[PDB]
Structure 1
Amino acid sequence: NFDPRPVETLNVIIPEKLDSFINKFAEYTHEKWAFDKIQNNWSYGENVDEELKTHPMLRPYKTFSEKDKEIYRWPIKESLKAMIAWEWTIEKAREGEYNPQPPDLSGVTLSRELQAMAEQLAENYHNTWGRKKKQELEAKGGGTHPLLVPYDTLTAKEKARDREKAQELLKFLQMNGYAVTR
């Protein structure tokens, strides 16, 4: 049985001094996506077109409106607000380390303790998805979904996407010299 309760972020305020990290990481996530698109021969085009493989977001993050940057910044803000909600500390302890070439995060090793923190983030992403999914199903007439179970009961394969998202955030924080502790 599954009763997902993602942490409540609505009144959680991110400190001003994280705004710079938020934009850098948003730019990173856009570049990564763009890089993968371009490797499959997508190119800029005014419209999204699956036959022609064009996408209007295939251009520099720097050239976006605030609305389009927000596509990438929103989910990062939601992750940071969950961490702040859980009373984790995020502090800049050290100095940090169209043709997108985003940094490679393959070589970033997270401590066991940060990997443990990634599990709480992943479970929260799963609970956010599961709560939204229950609403979506009810709005459409009812029905079910095989992943509407507690995160801990998921298979390793089923957990991967939420683990990868949680690891990417914690790796980019580390790379930019942030210590994350609880």
Structure 2
Amino acid sequence: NFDPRPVETLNVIIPEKLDSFINKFAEYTHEKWAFDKIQNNWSYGENVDEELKTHPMLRPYKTFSEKDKEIYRWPIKESLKAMIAWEWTIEKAREGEEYNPQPPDLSGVTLSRELQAMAEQLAENYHNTWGRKKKQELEAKGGGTHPLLVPYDTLTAKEKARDREKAQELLKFLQMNGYAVTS
């Protein structure tokens, strides 16, 4: 009994003004992925190689085409579309606090109880998005099941972590850049 219904966002229009945040958070997300990969001794390679630990995306975000940028911008647009569809407000209230990638540390950012509660909704929606997609993939490949095809609330803490973390990162980066997010 799991029928994931992620919020529909095909006809949600992100206001033009948010493009600056999208680009900035996309760069950030690429730079954090790059940091992680590099500290584990990955380097730039023209092709992806797990043995050689090379990756073509280990280069500056500014050097990317629009297609490569879109790898990072799409999921963020999907997040923002869901917030908008839920009729949350995102307004720039304040000025914000903010190959060798040095991404700003978001570890010192505290979210209010209320932003943490919003993060829970975004986290579940990520779960539903993953879930609905996984159902489609399993059908296309002949059936079967997956242990995480359960309601988000029934997941363990360990199981909730990755969705919670993505949601947290979005809201902390919104906060760090001076944005106020309310229900």
In structure 1, runs of 5+ residues without a counterpart are: none
User: Residue deviations 1:40-64, cap 9 Å, x none?
Assistant: 1111111111111111110000000
Give distance in 2, aligned partners of 1:54 and 1:111: 39
Q: CA separation in 1, counterparts of 2:35 and 2:79? A: 23
Q: SS in structure 2 opposite 1:71?
A: helix
Q: What CA deviation, in whole Å up to 9, does each residue of 1:88-117 have, x standing for no partner?
A: 000000001300010000000000000000
Aligned counterpart, 1:161? 162
Residue aligning to 2:139: 138
Bigger mean CA deviation after superposition, 75-84 or 51-60: 51-60
Cα separation, 2, equivalents of 1:52 and 1:156: 34
1:113-149 per-residue CA deviation (whole Å, 9 max, x = no partner) reads 0000000000000000000000000100000001000
| TM-score normalised by structure 2 residue count | 0.99
Q: Secondary structure at the match of 1:59?
A: coil
Return structure 1 stretches of 4+ with deviation > 6 angstroms.
Answer: none
Match in the other structure for 1:12: 12
Measured against aligned partners, the alpha-carbon deviations of 1:8-48 in whole angstroms (never above 9, x if no partner) come to 01000000000000000000000000001110111111111
Shift of 1:157: 0.8
Residue ranges of structure 2 left out of the alignment (5+ in a row): none
Q: Name whichever of 44-53 and 8-17 sits farther off.
A: 44-53
RMSD between aligned alpha carbons?
A: 0.5
1:165, distance to aligned residue in structure 2 (A): 0.3
Normalised by the length of structure 1, the TM-score is 0.99
How far the C-alpha of 1:174 sits from its partner, in A, is 0.1
Which residue of the partner structure matches residue 125 of structure 2?
124
* Partners of 1:124 and 1:89 in 2: CA distance: 18
Q: State how far apart, in whole Å, the 2-side matches of 1:143 and 1:26 are.
A: 35
Q: What is the number of residues matched between the two proteins?
A: 182
